[PDB]
Ligand binder design. Structure first.
Ligand SMILES: NC(=O)c1ccc[n+]([C@@H]2O[C@H](COP(=O)([O-])OP(=O)(O)OC[C@H]3O[C@@H](n4cnc5c(N)ncnc54)[C@H](OP(=O)(O)O)[C@@H]3O)[C@@H](O)[C@H]2O)c1
Ligand SMILES: O=C(O)C1(c2ccc(-c3cc(Cl)cc(Cl)c3)c(F)c2)CC1
Length: 316
């Protein structure tokens, strides 16, 4: 039930529910499982305009609020500005549109989803006559300024970023007249890509690293190489799981918590959802932690093939 204090004074629960499902998963499932996650103890819910599920996620919270299970102030709710909305004048309207879909007065946290700005307009993934995604050039410091206006108007209690590397964080950090540092940076983080260098950097700046694909990602065929290793079949995680008689997933989650990383976990399965809350019931030894440290293989599960050429692609 622990939270971590953010550098603007707000608190964030260290365990979060990921809500993204691919589009073939029907939208009514996001409503169901967000309800199950709250019943199970999740209070930190991660969504995004890209996910096409914020209305369902908002309806889940409203329902659990109306049945007396939680109050609005107990729920930590996250959304993200998609990359077609980086131009500063589009940021407050994008946030306001998310608030209307979810039917909430504020978000607990608003993020820049990705630093790879994209052609503004209505399509989430605008593409040219030759199938290429269409980039756009935007000064992210102006985007950030508009983010800061959103906190001031109280529509976002906290603001942060996602998928930034060190050079992009410093750019916000070294901004003349910077009012609010980012509270966090949400990045792909798991034993095969542990981001120890970035984590050390964010720790020195009082910026929380938040892990996604902490369980090795959904291995979606649009993005993930089928030949890539399966995180949860890893013999060291499996050996550790038997020792504590937990599960591999639970080893992977506990690893992030003990190194001070806030960890997300997606599951659309009732039983696995309730299992993940058990991450608070045990602890790994310092030597288990070193063993997991040695799995790092610089492996990004997400294959960028029209994105590697983006000037702001963060694995450059
Ligand atoms: N900011 C970004 O760019 C970004 C990028 C990616 C993701 N995210 C967010 O963070 C979340 C990241 O997670 P992810 O979507 O990449 O998937 P993930 O958390 O890495 O999970 C991958 C798979 O593990 C399964 N799983 C969950 N619990 C399990 C358990 N106890 N035992 C065995 N398997 C289990 C799930 O399958 P089942 O559903 O069948 O249980 C899930 O599909 C996303 O949902 C999204 O909210 C953000
Ligand atoms: O859950 C998410 O946020 C998704 C996602 C997954 C990955 C990315 C992403 C991938 C690469 Cl290779 C690079 C960057 Cl900056 C973001 C992204 F922008 C969005 C699956 C929709």
């Amino acid at each position: 039930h622990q939270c971590v204090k953010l550098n603007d004074g707000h608190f964030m629960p260290v365990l979060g529910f990921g809500t993204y499902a691919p589009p073939e998963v029907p939208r009514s499932k996001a409503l169901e499982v967000t309800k199950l996650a709250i019943e199970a103890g999740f209070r930190h819910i991660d969504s995004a305009h890209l996910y096409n599920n914020e209305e369902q996620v908002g309806l889940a919270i409203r329902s659990k609020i109306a049945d007396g299970s939680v109050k609005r102030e107990d729920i930590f709710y996250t959304s993200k500005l998609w990359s077609t909305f980086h131009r500063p004048e589009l940021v407050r309207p994008a946030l306001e549109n998310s608030l209307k879909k979810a039917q909430l007065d504020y978000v607990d946290l608003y993020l820049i989803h990705s630093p790879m700005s994209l052609k503004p307009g209505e399509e989430l993934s605008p593409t040219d006559e030759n199938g290429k995604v269409i980039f756009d050039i935007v000064d992210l410091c102006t985007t950030w300024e508009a983010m800061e206006k959103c906190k001031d108007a109280g529509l976002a209690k906290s603001i942060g970023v996602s998928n930034f590397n060190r050079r992009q964080l410093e750019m916000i950090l070294n901004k003349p007249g910077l009012k609010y540092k980012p509270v966090c940076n949400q990045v792909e983080c798991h034993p095969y890509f542990n981001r120890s260098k970035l984590l050390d950097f964010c720790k020195s700046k009082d910026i929380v690293l938040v892990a996604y694909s902490a369980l090795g990602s959904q291995r979606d065929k649009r993005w993930v190489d089928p030949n890539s290793p399966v995180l949860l079949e890893d013999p060291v995680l499996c050996a550790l799981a038997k020792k504590h008689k937990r599960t591999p997933a639970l080893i992977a989650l506990r690893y992030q918590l003990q190194r001070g990383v806030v960890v997300l976990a997606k599951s659309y399965n009732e039983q696995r959802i309730r299992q993940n809350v058990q991450v608070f019931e045990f602890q790994l030894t310092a030597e288990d932690m070193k063993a997991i440290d040695g799995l790092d293989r610089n492996l990004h599960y997400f294959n960028s093939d029209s994105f590697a050429s983006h000037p702001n692609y963060p694995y450059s």
